[PDB]
Every structure is written in C-alpha cells, then in structure tokens.
Short mmCIF file of C-alpha atoms in Angstrom, two decimals:
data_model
loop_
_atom_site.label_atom_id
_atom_site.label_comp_id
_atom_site.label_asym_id
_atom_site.label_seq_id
_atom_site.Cartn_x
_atom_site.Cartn_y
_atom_site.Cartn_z
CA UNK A 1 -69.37 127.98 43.42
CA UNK A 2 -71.61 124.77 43.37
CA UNK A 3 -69.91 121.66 43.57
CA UNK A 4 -70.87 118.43 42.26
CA UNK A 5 -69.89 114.59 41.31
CA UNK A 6 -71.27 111.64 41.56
CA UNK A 7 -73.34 110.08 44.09
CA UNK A 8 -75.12 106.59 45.25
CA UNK A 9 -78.54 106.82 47.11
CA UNK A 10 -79.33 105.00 49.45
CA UNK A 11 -79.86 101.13 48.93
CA UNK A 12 -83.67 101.26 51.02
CA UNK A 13 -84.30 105.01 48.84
CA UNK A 14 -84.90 106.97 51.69
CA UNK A 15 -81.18 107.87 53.30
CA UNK A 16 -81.11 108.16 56.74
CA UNK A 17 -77.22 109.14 56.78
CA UNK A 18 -74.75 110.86 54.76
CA UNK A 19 -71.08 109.78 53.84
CA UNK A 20 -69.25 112.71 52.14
CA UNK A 21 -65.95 111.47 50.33
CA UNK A 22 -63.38 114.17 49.64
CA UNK A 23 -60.98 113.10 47.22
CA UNK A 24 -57.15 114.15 47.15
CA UNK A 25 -54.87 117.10 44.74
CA UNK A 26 -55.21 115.27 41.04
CA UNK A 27 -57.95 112.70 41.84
CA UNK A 28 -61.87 113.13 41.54
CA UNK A 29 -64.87 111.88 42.97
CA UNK A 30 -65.41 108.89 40.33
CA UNK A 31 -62.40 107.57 42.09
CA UNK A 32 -63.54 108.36 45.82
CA UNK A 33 -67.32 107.16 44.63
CA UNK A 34 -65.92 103.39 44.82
CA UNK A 35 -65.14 103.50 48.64
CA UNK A 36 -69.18 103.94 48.26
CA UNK A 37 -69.54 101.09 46.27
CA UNK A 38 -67.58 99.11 48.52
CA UNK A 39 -69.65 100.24 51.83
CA UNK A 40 -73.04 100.68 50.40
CA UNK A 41 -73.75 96.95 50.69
CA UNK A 42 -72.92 97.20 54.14
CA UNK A 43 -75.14 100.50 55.06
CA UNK A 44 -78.26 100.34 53.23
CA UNK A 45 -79.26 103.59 55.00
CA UNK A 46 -76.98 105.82 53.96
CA UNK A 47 -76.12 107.99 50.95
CA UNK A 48 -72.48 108.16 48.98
CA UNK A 49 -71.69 111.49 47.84
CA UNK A 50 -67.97 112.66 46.10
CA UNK A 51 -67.88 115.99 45.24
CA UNK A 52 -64.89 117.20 42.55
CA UNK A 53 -62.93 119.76 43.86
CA UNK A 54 -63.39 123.36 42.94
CA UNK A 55 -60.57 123.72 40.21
CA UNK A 56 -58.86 122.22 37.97
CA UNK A 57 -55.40 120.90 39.54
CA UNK A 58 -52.42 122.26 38.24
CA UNK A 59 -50.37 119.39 38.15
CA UNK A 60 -53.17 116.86 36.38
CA UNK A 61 -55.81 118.96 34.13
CA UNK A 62 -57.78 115.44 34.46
CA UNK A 63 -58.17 115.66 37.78
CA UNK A 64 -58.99 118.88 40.60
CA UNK A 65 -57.62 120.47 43.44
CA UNK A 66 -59.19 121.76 46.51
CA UNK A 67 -56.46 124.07 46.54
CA UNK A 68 -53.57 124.51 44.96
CA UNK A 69 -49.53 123.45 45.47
CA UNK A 70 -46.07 124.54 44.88
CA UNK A 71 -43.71 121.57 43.97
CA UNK A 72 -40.15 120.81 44.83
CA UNK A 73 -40.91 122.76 48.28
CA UNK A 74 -42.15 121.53 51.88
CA UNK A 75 -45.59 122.16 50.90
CA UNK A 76 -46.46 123.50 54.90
CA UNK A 77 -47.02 127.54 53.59
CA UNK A 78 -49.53 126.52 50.87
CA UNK A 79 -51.59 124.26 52.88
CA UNK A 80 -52.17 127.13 55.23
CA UNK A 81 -53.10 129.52 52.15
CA UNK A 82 -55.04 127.52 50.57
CA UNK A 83 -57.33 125.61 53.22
CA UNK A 84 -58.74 128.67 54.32
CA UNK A 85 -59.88 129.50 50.21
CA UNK A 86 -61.37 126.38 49.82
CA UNK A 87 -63.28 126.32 53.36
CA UNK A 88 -66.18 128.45 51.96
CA UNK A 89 -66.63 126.36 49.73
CA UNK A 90 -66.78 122.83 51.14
CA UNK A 91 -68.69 124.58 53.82
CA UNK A 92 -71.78 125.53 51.41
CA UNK A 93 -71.43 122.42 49.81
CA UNK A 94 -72.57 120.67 52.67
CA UNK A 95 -75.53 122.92 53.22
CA UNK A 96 -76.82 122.07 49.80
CA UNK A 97 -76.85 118.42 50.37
CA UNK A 98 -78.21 118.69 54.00
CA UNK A 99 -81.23 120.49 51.69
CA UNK A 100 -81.28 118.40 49.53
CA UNK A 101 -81.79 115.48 51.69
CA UNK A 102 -83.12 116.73 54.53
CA UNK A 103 -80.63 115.96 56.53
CA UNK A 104 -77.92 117.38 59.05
CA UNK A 105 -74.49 117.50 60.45
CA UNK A 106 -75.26 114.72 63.18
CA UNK A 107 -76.32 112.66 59.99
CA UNK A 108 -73.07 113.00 58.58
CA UNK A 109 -69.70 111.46 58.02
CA UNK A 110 -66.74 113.30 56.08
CA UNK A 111 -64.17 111.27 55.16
CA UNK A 112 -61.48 112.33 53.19
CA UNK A 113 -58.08 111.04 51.54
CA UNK A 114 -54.72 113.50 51.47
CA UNK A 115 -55.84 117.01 51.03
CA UNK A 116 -59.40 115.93 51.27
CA UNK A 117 -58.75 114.50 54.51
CA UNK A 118 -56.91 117.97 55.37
CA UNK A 119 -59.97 119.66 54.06
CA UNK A 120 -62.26 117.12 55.89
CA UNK A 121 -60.33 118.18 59.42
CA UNK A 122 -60.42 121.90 58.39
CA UNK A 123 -64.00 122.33 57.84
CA UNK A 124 -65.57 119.88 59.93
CA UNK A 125 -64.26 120.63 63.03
CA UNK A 126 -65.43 124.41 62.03
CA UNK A 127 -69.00 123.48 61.78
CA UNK A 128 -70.99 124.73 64.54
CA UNK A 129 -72.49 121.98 65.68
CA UNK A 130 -71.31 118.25 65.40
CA UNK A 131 -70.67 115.93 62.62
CA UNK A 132 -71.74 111.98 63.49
CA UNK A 133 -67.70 111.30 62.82
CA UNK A 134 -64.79 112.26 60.46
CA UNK A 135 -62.16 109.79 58.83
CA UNK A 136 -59.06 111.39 57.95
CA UNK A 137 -57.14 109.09 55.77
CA UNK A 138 -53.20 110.32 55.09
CA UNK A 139 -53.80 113.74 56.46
CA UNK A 140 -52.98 115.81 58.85
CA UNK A 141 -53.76 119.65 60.75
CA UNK A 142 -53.36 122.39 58.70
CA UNK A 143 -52.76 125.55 61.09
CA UNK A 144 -53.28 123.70 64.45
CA UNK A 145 -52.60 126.70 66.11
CA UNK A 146 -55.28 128.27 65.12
CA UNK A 147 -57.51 124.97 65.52
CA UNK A 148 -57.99 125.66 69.48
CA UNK A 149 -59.46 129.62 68.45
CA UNK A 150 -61.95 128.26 65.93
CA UNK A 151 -62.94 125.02 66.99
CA UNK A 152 -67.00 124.74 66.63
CA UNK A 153 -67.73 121.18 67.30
CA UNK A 154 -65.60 117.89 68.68
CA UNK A 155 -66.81 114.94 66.52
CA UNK A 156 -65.45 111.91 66.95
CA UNK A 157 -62.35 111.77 64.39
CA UNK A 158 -60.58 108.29 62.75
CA UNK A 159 -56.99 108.96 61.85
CA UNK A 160 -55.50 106.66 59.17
CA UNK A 161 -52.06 106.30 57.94
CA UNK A 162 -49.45 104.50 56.20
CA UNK A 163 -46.17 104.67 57.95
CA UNK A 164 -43.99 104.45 54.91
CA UNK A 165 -45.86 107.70 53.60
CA UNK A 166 -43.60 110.01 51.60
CA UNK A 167 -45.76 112.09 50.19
CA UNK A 168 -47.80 113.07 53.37
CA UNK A 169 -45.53 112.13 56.04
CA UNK A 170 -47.16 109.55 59.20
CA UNK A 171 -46.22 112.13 62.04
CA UNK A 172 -49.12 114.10 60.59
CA UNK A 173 -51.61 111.95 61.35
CA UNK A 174 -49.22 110.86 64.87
CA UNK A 175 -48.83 114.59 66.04
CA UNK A 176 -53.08 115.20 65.26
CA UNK A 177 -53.94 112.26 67.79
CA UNK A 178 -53.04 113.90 70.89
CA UNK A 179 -53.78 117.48 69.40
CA UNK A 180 -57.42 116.26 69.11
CA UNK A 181 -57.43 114.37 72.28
CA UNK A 182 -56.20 117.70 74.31
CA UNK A 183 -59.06 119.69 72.60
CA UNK A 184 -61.90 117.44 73.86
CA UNK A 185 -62.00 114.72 70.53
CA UNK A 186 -62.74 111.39 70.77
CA UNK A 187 -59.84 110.66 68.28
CA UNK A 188 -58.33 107.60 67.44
CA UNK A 189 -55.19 106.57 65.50
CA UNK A 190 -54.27 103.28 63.12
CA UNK A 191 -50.89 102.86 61.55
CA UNK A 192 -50.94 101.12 58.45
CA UNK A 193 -47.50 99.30 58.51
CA UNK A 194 -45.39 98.90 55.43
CA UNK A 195 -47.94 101.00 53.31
CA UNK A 196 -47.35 104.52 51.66
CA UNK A 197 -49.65 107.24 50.23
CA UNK A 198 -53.08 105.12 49.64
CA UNK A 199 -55.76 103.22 51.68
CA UNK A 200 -54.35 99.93 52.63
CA UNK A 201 -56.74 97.35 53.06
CA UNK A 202 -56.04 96.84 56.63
CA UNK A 203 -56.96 101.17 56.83
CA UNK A 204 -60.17 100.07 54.81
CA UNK A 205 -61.13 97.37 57.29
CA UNK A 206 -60.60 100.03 60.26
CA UNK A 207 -62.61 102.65 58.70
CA UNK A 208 -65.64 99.46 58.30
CA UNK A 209 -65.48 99.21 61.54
CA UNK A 210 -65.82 102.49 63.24
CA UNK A 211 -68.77 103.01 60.45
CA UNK A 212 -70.30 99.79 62.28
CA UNK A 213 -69.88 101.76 65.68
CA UNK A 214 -71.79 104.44 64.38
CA UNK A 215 -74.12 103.31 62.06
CA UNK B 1 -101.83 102.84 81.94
CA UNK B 2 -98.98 100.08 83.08
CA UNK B 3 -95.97 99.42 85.40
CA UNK B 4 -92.92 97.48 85.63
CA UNK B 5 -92.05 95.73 89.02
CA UNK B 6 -76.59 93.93 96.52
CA UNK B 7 -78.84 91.59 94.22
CA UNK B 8 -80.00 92.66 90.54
CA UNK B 9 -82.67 95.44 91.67
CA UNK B 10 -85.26 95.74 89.83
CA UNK B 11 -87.20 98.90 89.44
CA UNK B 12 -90.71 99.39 89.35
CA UNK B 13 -92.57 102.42 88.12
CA UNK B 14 -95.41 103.54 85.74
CA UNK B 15 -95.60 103.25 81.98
CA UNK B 16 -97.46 105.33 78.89
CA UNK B 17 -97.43 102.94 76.10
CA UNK B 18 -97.18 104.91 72.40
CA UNK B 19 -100.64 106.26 71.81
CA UNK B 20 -100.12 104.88 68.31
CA UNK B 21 -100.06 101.63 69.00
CA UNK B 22 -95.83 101.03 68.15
CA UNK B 23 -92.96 102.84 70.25
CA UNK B 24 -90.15 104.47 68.08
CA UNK B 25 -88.69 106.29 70.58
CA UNK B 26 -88.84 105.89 74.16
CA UNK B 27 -88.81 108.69 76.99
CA UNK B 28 -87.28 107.85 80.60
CA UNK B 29 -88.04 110.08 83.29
CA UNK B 30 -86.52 110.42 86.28
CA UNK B 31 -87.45 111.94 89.77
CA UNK B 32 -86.28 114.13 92.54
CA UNK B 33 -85.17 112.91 96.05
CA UNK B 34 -88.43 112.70 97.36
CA UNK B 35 -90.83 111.75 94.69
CA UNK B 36 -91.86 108.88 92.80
CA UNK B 37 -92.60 107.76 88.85
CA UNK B 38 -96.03 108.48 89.49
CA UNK B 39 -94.68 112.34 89.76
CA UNK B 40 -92.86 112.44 86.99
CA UNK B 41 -95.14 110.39 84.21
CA UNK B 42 -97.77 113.30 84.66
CA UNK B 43 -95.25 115.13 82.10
CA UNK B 44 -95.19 111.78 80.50
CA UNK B 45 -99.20 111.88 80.00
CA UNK B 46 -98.42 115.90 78.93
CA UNK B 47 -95.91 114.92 76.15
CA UNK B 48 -97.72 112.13 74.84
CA UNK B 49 -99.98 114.35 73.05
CA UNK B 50 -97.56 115.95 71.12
CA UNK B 51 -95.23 112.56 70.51
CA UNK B 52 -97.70 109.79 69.75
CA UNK B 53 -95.04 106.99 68.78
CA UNK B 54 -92.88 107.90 71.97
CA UNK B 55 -93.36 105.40 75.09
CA UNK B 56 -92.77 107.10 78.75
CA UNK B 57 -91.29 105.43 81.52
CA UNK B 58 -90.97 106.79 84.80
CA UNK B 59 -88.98 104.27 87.10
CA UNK B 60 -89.47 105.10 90.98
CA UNK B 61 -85.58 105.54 92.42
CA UNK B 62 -84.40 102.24 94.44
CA UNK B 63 -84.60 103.38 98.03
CA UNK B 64 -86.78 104.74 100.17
CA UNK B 65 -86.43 108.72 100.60
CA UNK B 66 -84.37 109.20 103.83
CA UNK B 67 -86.47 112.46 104.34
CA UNK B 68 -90.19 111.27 103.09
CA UNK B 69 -90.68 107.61 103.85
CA UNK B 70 -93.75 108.04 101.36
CA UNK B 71 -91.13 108.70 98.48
CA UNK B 72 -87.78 107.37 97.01
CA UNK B 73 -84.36 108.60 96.90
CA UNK B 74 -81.49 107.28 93.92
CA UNK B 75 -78.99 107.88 96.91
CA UNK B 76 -79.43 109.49 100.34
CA UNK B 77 -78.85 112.96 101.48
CA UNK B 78 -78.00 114.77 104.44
CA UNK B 79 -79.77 118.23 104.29
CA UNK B 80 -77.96 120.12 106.88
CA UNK B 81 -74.90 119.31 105.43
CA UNK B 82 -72.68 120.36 102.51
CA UNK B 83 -74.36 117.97 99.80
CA UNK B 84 -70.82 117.25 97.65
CA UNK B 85 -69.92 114.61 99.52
CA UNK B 86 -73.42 112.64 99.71
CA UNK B 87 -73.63 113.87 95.85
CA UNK B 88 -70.09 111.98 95.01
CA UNK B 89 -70.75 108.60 96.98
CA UNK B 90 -74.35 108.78 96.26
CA UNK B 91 -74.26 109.17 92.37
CA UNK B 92 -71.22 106.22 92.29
CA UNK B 93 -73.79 103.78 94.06
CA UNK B 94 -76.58 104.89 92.38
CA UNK B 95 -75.42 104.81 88.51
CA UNK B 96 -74.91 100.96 88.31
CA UNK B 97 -78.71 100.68 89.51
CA UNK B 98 -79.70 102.97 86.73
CA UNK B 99 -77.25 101.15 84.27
CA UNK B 100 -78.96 98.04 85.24
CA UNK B 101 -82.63 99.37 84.69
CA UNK B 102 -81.89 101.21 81.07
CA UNK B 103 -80.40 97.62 79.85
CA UNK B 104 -83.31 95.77 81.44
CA UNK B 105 -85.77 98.21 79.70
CA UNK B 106 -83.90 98.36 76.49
CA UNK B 107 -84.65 94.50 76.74
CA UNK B 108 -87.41 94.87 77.24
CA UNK B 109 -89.08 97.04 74.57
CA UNK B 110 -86.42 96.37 72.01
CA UNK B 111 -85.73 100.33 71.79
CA UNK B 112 -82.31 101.38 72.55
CA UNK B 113 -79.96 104.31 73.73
CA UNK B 114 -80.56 106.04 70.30
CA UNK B 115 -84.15 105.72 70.31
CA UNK B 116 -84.01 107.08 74.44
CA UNK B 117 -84.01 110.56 75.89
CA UNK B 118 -83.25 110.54 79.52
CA UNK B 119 -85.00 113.25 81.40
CA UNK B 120 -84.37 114.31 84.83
CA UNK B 121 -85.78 116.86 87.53
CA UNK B 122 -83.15 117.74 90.69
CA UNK B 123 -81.40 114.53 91.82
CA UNK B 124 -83.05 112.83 89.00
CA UNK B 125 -81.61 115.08 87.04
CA UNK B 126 -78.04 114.87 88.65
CA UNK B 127 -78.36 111.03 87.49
CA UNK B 128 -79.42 111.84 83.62
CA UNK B 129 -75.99 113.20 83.10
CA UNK B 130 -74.09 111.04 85.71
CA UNK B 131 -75.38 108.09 84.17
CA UNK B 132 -76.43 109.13 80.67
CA UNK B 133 -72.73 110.87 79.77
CA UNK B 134 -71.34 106.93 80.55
CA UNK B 135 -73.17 105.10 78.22
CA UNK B 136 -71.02 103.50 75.93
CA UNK B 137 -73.36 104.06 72.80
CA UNK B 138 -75.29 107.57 72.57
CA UNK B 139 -78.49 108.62 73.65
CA UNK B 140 -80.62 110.45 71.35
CA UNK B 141 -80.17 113.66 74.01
CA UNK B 142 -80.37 113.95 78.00
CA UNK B 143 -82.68 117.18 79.51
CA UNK B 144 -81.49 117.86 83.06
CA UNK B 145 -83.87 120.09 85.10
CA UNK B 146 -83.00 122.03 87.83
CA UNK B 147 -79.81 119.46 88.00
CA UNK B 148 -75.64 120.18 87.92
CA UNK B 149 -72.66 117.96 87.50
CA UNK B 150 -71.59 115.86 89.96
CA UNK B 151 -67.83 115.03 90.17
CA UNK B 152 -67.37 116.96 86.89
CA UNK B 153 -63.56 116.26 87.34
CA UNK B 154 -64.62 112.36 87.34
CA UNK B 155 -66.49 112.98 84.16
CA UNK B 156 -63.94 113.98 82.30
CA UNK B 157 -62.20 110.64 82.56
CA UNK B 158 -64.90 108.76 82.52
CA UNK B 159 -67.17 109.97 79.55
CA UNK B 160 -68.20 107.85 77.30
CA UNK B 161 -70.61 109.08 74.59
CA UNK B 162 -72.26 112.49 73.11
CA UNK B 163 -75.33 113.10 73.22
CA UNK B 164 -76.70 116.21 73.12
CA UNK B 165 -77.74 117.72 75.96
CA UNK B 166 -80.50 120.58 77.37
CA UNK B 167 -79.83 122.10 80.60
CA UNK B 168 -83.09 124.11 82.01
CA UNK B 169 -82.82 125.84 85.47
CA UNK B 170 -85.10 128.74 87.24
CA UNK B 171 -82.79 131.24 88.66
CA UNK B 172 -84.65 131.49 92.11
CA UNK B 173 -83.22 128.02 93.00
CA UNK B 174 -82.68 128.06 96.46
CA UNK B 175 -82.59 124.43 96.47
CA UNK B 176 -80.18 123.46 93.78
CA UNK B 177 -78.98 127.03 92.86
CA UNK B 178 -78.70 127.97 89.12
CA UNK B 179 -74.77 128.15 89.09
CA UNK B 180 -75.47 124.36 88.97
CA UNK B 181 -76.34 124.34 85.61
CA UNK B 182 -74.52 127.53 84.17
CA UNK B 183 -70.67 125.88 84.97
CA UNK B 184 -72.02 122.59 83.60
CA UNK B 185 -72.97 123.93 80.17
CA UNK B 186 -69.27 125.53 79.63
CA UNK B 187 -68.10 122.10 81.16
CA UNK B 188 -70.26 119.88 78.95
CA UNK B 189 -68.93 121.82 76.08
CA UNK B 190 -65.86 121.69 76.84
CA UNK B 191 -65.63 117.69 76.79
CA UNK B 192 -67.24 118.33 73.05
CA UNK B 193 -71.17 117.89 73.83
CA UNK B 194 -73.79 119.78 71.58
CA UNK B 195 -74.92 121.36 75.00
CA UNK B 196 -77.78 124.47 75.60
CA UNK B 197 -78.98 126.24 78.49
CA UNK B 198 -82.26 127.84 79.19
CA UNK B 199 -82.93 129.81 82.26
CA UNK B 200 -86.36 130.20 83.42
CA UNK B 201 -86.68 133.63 84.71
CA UNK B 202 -88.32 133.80 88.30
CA UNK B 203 -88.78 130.31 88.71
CA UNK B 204 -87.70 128.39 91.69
CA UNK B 205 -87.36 124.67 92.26
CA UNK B 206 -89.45 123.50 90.05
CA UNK B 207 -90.47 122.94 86.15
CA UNK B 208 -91.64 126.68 84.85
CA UNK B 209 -93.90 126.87 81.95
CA UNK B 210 -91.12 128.40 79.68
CA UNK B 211 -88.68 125.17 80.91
CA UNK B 212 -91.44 123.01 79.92
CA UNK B 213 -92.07 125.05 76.48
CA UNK B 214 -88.11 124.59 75.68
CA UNK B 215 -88.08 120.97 76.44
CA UNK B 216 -91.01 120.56 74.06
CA UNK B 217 -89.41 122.34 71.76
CA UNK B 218 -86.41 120.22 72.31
CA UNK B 219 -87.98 116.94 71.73
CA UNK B 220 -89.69 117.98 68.73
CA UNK B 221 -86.51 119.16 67.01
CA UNK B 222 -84.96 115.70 67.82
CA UNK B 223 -87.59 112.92 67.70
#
C-alpha cells in the first residue's frame, strides 16, 4: 500500500537531500512535518517528507500505527510481530520518493520518534546499501538478534533519549549504542536528563547538530 | 596543462583544469613506487573527456624512489624483503604528507573531500585507503588499483569516515597479488563501507581495459 502525508520541498526547489520523519503509534505526519519546519530554514537543500502510517491505530482512530499494540502488557512480543509487517511497507515507500526525486539512500536521512524510530532502525539498517544517517529518537532494537543476520548497510545512527522515559524505557536506546558499535556503526548516544517520552529541546539541538555534520 | 610546486612539504605535480571552464568535482591521482604525476594524469587527460567539470591532479610522491632515482616513492621499500614491515612504517610516515597536500589543495581550489575521489595504482593505491579511510569528513569514493590494506587491524581503530569504495585488481599480480584486494573488500565491509570488487581477468600489474571500463563506470554513477 502507498503511503503518503505531507511534505516541504526544498527551500532552493531543487532538493539535493531527503529527511524522512516517521512519526510514533497515535501521531501522524502533520505532527512530525513541524520538525521540518523547524530545520528547513537551516537546510535549504533538502526535502521534509512525513509519511502516515499504514493503519489506523487502535488506540486513537485520529491518528495511525505502523503496527499495532497490546496494552496493559510488556509490549516486547508485538514489536517483534509487527516490525517485520510493516517493513515492506516503509521499504517501498522509500523507493517511491527516491523516484520521485531522483534521489537515493546516500541522500537520505530517516529519523524517527517511538515506533517510528523502531521502524526507522528496522528498515534502514536493512537497506542494501547505506543511508547518509538515521536519528532514532526514544527507540530502541526490535529483534537485535536477528539484527547481526540481516544487517545490509552501517549508516551512521544518532540515538536520543529521555532518561525519565516510561513509556519507552532509556536502556533501549543505552543497550542499542554498543549493539551498533559491535556491528561496525558509527553510533552515538545523548541522554536527555529529566525528560520523558518526547523530544526535549536539548535532543532537538543534538539532532541540529549532527544534521550540520552531514549536511 | 599546469602544475603545483620535517618542514611543511609541499608537493608538486601536474594539473588538468575542468575542460568547462569551472571544477565541481576534483579527481586526485596517485602513483606507484616508482612513477611520477606525469604517469598517472595520462588517465587524467583519458577521463577528462567523459567528466568535463572534474579537475585532475596528479601529485608526484615526496621522495625520491629508492629503486628508480628517475621516479618517486610515498615511503621506501625493500624488495627482497617481506614488504609488511616497510608497508606499516612507510604508510604511518607517509599519510601526514598526503593529509597535508589534500588540505593544501582543498585550499586551494575551494573543492573539498565531498567533491574529491582519491584514486590510486599499487603503493599509490595502498595510500588512497590508508589515508582516504582517515579523513574526518567523507570523500565522494576512493578507487584502489592493484592496492590492499595496510595495517587493516590499525584501521579499524582508526577509521574515520565512509566513503564508498572500488577495489579493481588483475589476478596475475605477481607484484601485489590479488588476495590483496579480495580480504580488503570483506574487511572494508565489515567496518560498514559501501565497498565493490572487480577482478580483471588475466591482467597483471597493471590497469586492464575492463579495470579502466569499471572505474569509468564508477565515476559516472557518482559524479
């Protein structure tokens, strides 16, 4: 199924690089589609694009899911399920905006929140060859054992995190750092302290920066 | 047509300016222990006609060959000998020189390490990855001929960017056999490089037509 939501071209019309925002279970991409607004002013080469996920979510019919959850349960066995189901997906979105735009993977940033950020971590480090980076905001791995079989490309990954994070708990993000590092990443960790499930402004401000490295 | 020319050395070696007029990507090429720039820009003069807004550079290596006093040498050899050792010291000593140059050039022009390819032949070649993989900001892609890694348990401490990378080798290498550059390409992937590897079937020490035909290939797909 084709997936779509709303996007921001390039501020100089012709993008020469591609920021993919995934947005998290019961959000949407009009609410991922501001981190664009925020950044465009900064990259006038690149395009903003925030896909809705591919079904309604359960829990909020305003919003989508990339996959969906059980509540009142460790949610660890429905993660595994349901990444692999929405993989396909995600997957051919990304070819249809690479032709769209004539662009490609080393063009390209994912950057996700929650279970976009678990999606962004499961697909992009499938893709055969190498994204320009991910950010992973309030993720983590979902089946890191089989992470080292299918592995297809090492990007360079941004993990972000609020340590007071019930909903996603920080040792996600902590126990992905070395994970990454031991299969040949260039990963790199930043705590946001006294913050929860959301992108603190000091996580914002870490994320400009490593876009400045790349960009 | 052109030329640039312990203490901050210098290198000096011929230049192909962008036949149209304004450089948007820039070509470095670098020669075996033996040889000279003026070797090495003939593929420069070869390429041009297929990349018209790429400048070539073709820096000769910063000491005299040990073995041809008519040539250079990026670090000194002893050819009866096991060459790891000589490789290990040699490539150490020799990388800030090369450092030194690309920064100078970069500089110079006003290109940088994402508008550069680094492209090596044999010893030259040894130095596009030695040097090239420790660049703190990407080049758009390295092509080591007829080259290996040296100190490959070094480099995975010490590397420092991505680019992508094309290994091309002719299996009848007696010189720098072809094992050279089929454990680098598991290596290279390994450490999360976009790496390739063409072998060019009965070819010896040397750039084969089919090596040449996959580099062109190569740069067209990137530049």
């Amino acid at each position: 199924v084709k997936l779509s939501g709303p996007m921001l071209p390039a501020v100089s019309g012709a993008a020469k690089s591609l920021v993919v925002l995934l947005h998290g279970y019961g959000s949407d991409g009009r609410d991922l589609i501001a981190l664009g607004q925020f950044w465009r002013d900064s990259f006038p080469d690149t395009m903003f694009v925030a896909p809705n996920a591919p079904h309604v979510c359960g829990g909020n019919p305003f919003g989508y899911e990339w996959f969906p959850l059980d509540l009142e349960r460790d949610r660890t066995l429905a993660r595994l399920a349901g990444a692999e189901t929405a993989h396909p997906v995600l997957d051919a979105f990304l070819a249809d905006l690479w032709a769209q735009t004539g662009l490609g993977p080393a063009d390209t940033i994912l950057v996700g929140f929650s279970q976009g950020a678990m999606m962004a971590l499961y697909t992009g480090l499938r893709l055969p060859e190498p994204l320009k980076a991910i950010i992973a905001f309030s993720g983590l791995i979902v089946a890191p054992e089989k992470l080292e079989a299918e592995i297809a490309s090492k990007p360079p990954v941004l993990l972000i995190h609020g340590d007071l994070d019930d909903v996603v708990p920080v040792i996600g993000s902590e126990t992905a750092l070395p994970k990454l590092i031991d299969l040949g990443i260039d990963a790199r960790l930043h705590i946001s302290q006294g913050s929860g499930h959301t992108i603190a402004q000091d996580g914002l401000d870490t994320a400009t920066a490593f876009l400045r490295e790349i960009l």
